Design a protein around this ligand. Structure first.
Ligand SMILES: CN(C)c1ccncc1
Length: 283
């Protein structure tokens, strides 16, 4: 099935919390053995959220190459994303070796450091220009260059330098600050605006390495962000833009990281944002 009409042959009844259900049953299941090793227990935020052995991102530190991060590769769309969990206090270093190793240009963050009275991730970048950050047993230096605070999001220019070779690189930080603590945004307009800023930056482009995207666990908000982006790009590309099937895309993405799209409400919100963005992509 025009996915807008399936937005109403579901909201109608309310089989939202049953479509999501079929998605869970039909999703892929591959091995996550590296992630379950006892020596990597402290590298994982949750024990039920792990990357697959076949698509995990490996780090060059031969000592231990493990990080909770996955490469999502979309063939038709010509798009690649790294989805990861928000860094822990002890994996801050590992997060930046990854970014460097992969040649990524942008980091996309979909949560606040603190939500619901608990920490969603470590403070992994500097809040002040004159106070730069260093990482233990990492050989990197990160400096805040500028920052631009707007209503629903903030964009930061950062510098990352290899201390052993003195090589420097520009990283842009795209931080969506207003996702509500519970539920989803009523309106998808500010989220669509955000996406489009990230696109405009050129961060999603093949000249550079894949964008790094995270939230807390790196599967819920993070999955909304990639699914939407891919589905809208696909609309630009096909002859007939109404042939795009979102479960189909979403099921394809779950071959690479488990659990993408955490709730029924997130699913809904995804269908809701694509339908909306499709009105533009046809300007
Ligand atoms: C594995 N995990 C939740 C943590 C590790 C180190 N510090 C805080 C949390």
């Amino acid at each position: 099935m025009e996915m807008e009409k399936e937005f109403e042959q579901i909201d109608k009844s309310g089989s939202w919390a049953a479509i999501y259900q079929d998605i869970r049953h039909e999703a892929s299941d591959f091995p996550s053995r590296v992630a379950k090793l006892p020596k990597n227990k402290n590298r994982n935020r949750y024990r039920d959220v792990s990357p697959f052995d076949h698509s995990r991102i490996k780090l060059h530190q031969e000592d231990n190459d493990y990080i909770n991060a996955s490469l999502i590769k979309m063939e038709e769309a010509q798009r690649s994303y790294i989805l990861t969990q928000g860094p822990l206090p002890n994996t801050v270093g590992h997060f930046w070796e990854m970014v460097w190793e992969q040649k990524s240009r942008g980091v996309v963050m979909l949560n606040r450091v603190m939500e619901k009275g608990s920490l969603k991730c470590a403070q992994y970048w500097p809040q002040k220009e004159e106070k730069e950050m260093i990482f233990e047993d990492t050989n990197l230096k990160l400096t805040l260059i500028s920052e631009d605070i707007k209503s629903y999001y903030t964009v930061r220019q950062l510098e990352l330098e290899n201390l052993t070779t003195q090589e420097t690189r520009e990283i842009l930080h795209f931080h969506y600050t207003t996702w509500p603590d519970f539920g989803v945004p009523e309106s998808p307009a500010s989220f669509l605006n955000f996406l489009f800023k990230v696109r405009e930056s050129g961060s999603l482009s093949p000249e550079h390495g894949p964008v790094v995207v995270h939230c807390s666990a790196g599967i819920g908000r993070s999955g909304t962000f990639c699914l939407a982006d891919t589905c809208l790009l696909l609309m630009d590309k096909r002859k007939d833009p109404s042939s795009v099937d979102i479960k189909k895309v979403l099921l394809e993405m779950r071959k690479f990281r488990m659990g993408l799209i955490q709730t029924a409400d997130q699913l809904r919100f995804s269908y809701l944002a694509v339908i909306e963005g499709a009105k533009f992509i046809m300007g």
